Amino acid sequence: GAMGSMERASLIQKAKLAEQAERYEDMAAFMKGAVEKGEELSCEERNLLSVAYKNVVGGQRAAWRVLSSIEQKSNGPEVREYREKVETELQGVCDTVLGLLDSHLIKEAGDAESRVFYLKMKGDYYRYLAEVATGDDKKRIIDSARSAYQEAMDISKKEMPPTNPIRLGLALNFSVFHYEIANSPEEAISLAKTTFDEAMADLHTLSEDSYKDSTLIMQLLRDNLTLWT
């Protein structure tokens, strides 16, 4: 890799500079390099990894949706060609993330936090592929997403309080999977409502160092429920 000669700590440092500069492709590149050193990521480093790649693929998804909308609104080859160029790029970024997760990050040992977060991350990026997939690949991508989310859910229910932000964010994102990718509006509303209600029932488990994250996700759960009802 292009980062192989750089020290891990310099890679972390530079990802933080790139975040400050809103250079999220660079930031993602630095974090990939950090991951490839083969050591586990701390909580702060996992956030850097997550923020960088979500920013990259977020811009790609938003581009793809504009071009897809234009494509269907006109249903020459230019719109389809350009949409496939963005779609191919997006798939390449998702494959890079999923490869890092399999080659380096997802393990049987380590934190419940770390293990849930990477399985959630695997679920998300399969979901991003599922957004642009068709046919003999779509249902296979959908099942890899469901399977990764489900494992993360089992672990989180067993090992995390119901207000934990990874547990909540995972549940939010699984419910979005249900509603948008699996077309199971009932499962979506049922998971989101349970997640929110169990969070309030054990509201006392909020952590001093993450309660702002927790209460944000709880509100987003309620936003989705309002939308879906």
Partner: peptide, 10 residues
């Protein structure tokens, strides 16, 4: 509005 997923924080 579409469904909202986990945002980026810090």
């Amino acid at each position: 509005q579409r469904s909202t997923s986990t945002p980026n924080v810090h």
